[PDB]
């Protein structure tokens, strides 16, 4: 009644880690519970491929890459991830006439460069990549089912619009679950297009209602539903997408399956700001990922994001100001591996003593303690800023121990392997 309800998955038969995540469906941190076993079905909104990707895009896809690496590499969940490519869009159509190359060729160019930028940043590719151009037929079938369930109507011009009022009336459906307060051819202004009648000279596709294009949001419901099904464990995106885009996805999918909860956990990354405003192509304040990579390394850019909680906004000071700290941390990690590898290489079993000393025991106690601190940090909504700090403090103490104390060779190797494990989870390469 007047407020959306959320149903936590049952814990029986599920992998229970006591992980808590910031869920935009509850606007709170709640325990994460798989729908089935240790499996996570995850859909993340992808880019609109008409121009270069910038540092703001890097923040979202790197941040959810880190979260994915924590879920899989650290907690041993089984993640099945899908990311779409929006290769049909008003921006793509307009840009293609300006550039006087085919719309498919333009979209394929900037999709190719998007994945190259992701690879440059050590971002894992998803399990599946779904292009709108390859799913238009499935989109048409999806819209047909929504109409059959009486949740969409066809205008005379040949467009199809979602019927918000009819959808709300159903007791099992609520519109705008995550931003309830954000709410001629249409019944009501809040109705949004599932199928757009095509304007002349635009690319178009056949449908039962006439030549047209998919609407802004129908592509994501169709693709996620086809591959992942009627319940998603995780759906992700930047916070700007929460409404209208993500709330409208929930309405479309609920209308298709005629059920109440298409997504269990909705995660939204915070925006990267530059001089107080979201980094955006519109504001012309953006730094491309390629330009960023001519000045800084993949590790340094990922450290920038590791230092900022994924779901909070962050301020990026350009001209290297924000990257001063990132460069210092990367340099100390590189030097740590140089030193510890050298101490291991030069260790002589024949002459050195291996008595387990008080100094050895103290370092070990700090080592196991650091493992538990980092475990709590990851459970605490993927708190990488504090996990990174824990590693820094441990490295500070290993450096002291290596300089003076007689070194336990096995202890140093064990610690090196643990730090490698955490850095693999972070996406750092040393």
Q: Which residues bind ligand ATP (CB under 6 A)?
A: 13-18, 37-38, 45, 47-48, 56-57, 59-60, 76, 78, 237-238, 240-241, 269, 271-272, 278-282, 371-372, 375
268 within 8 A of 238, measured Cβ to Cβ: yes
Give the up-direction half-sphere exposure of residue 296: CA atoms within 13 A in the CB hemisphere. 28
Cβ-based nearer residue to ligand ATP, 45 or 234: 45
Q: How far apart are CA 207 and CA 144, in angstroms?
A: 10
Does position 79 interact with Zn ion (CB under 5 A)? The reply is no
Considering CB distances under 5 to 8 angstroms, the limit depending on partner class, which of its own copies, Zn ion, ligand ATP, none binds residue 220? Zn ion
Number of residues that bind Na ion (CB under 5 A): 4
Q: Is 430 among the residues that bind its own copies (CB under 8 A)? A: no
CA-CA distance, 66 to 61, in Å (whole number)? Answer: 9
Name the token pair of 29.
């941190």
Q: Which position among 226, 288, 322, 383 is part of the footprint of its own copies (CB under 8 A)?
A: 226
Q: How many Å is the Cα radius of gyration of the chain?
A: 25
Span interacting with Na ion, options 18-26, 173-181, 274-282, 394-402, rule CB under 5 A: 173-181
User: How far is residue 337 from each of residues 330, 332, 345, 423, measured CA to CA in Å?
Assistant: 11, 9, 12, 12
- In angstroms, the CA 50 to CA 311 distance is 27
Least Å from the CB of residue 70 to its own copies: 12
Task: Check binding of 83 to Zn ion (CB under 5 A).
Answer: no
* Partner interacting with residue 243 (select from its own copies, Na ion, ligand ATP, none; CB below 5-8 Å by kind): Na ion
Assigned token pair, 141: 């079938």
* 247: exposed, middle or buried (Cβ count in 10 Å: 0-12, 13-18, 19+): buried
Of the candidates 7, 188, 319, 350, which one interacts with its own copies according to CB under 8 A? Answer: 350
Sheet containing 272-274: give its strands across. Answer: 277-278, 272-274, 314-316
Q: Which of residues 124-153 bind its own copies (CB under 8 A)?
A: 124-131, 134-135
Phi, psi of 375 (to 5 degrees): -60, -45
Cα angle value 253/258/266 (rounded, 5°): 40
Binding segment (CB under 8 A) for its own copies, from list 139-147, 174-182, 284-292, 355-363: 355-363
Q: Which is nearer to Na ion, 4 or 158 (CB)?
A: 4
- Binding stretches for its own copies (CB under 8 A): 37, 39, 74-76, 78, 80-82, 108-109, 111-112, 115, 124-131, 134-135, 226-227, 349-350, 353-356, 360-361, 364, 368, 371-372, 408-411, 413-414, 417
């Amino acid at each position: 009644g007047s407020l959306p309800k959320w149903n936590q998955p049952s814990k029986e038969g599920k992998k229970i880690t006591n992980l808590f995540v910031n869920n935009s469906l509850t606007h709170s941190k709640v325990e994460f519970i798989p729908q089935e076993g240790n499996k996570i079905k995850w859909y993340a909104c992808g880019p609109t491929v008409y121009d270069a990707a910038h540092l703001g895009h890097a923040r979202t896809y790197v941040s959810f890459d880190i979260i994915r690496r924590i879920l899989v590499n650290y907690f041993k969940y089984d993640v099945f991830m899908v990311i779409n490519i929006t290769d049909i869009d008003d921006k793509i159509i307009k840009r293609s006439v300006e550039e006087k190359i085919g719309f498919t060729e333009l979209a394929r160019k900037w999709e190719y460069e998007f994945w190259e930028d992701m690879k440059s940043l050590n971002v894992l590719l998803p399990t599946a990549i779904t292009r709108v151009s390859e799913y238009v037929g499935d989109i048409v079938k999806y819209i047909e089912k929504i109409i059959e369930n009486k949740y969409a109507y066809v205008s005379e011009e040949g467009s199809v619009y979602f019927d918000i009022d009819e959808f709300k009336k159903s007791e099992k459906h609520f519109y705008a679950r995550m931003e309830p307060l954000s709410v001629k051819k249409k019944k009501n202004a809040y109705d949004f297009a599932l199928w757009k009648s095509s304007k002349p000279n635009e690319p178009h596709w056949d449908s039962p209602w006439g030549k047209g294009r998919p609407g802004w949001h129908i592509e994501c419901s169709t693709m996620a539903s086809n591959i992942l099904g009627d319940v998603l464990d995780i759906h992700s995106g930047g916070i700007d997408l929460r409404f209208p885009h993500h709330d409208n996805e929930l309405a479309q999918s609920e209308a298709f399956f005629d059920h109440s909860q298409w997504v269990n956990y909705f995660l939204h990354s915070g925006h990267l700001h530059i001089e107080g405003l979201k980094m955006s192509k519109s504001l012309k304040n953006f730094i491309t990922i390629k330009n960023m990579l001519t000045k800084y390394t993949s590790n340094q850019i990922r450290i920038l994001f590791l230092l900022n909680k994924w779901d909070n906004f962050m301020n990026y000071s350009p001209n290297g100001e924000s990257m001063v700290q990132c460069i210092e941390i990367d340099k100390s990690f590189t030097n740590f591996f140089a030193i510890i590898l050298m101490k291991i290489k030069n260790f002589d079993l024949n002459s050195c003593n291996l008595y387990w000393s008080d100094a050895d025991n103290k370092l070990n106690l700090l080592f196991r303690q650091t493992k538990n601190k980092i475990h709590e940090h990851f459970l605490d909504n993927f708190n990488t800023p504090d996990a990174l700090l824990a590693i820094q403090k441990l490295i500070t103490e290993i450096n002291i121990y290596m300089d003076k104390e007689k070194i336990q060779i096995g202890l140093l190797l064990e610690i090196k392997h643990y730090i490698n494990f955490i850095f693999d989870t972070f996406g750092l390469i040393y």
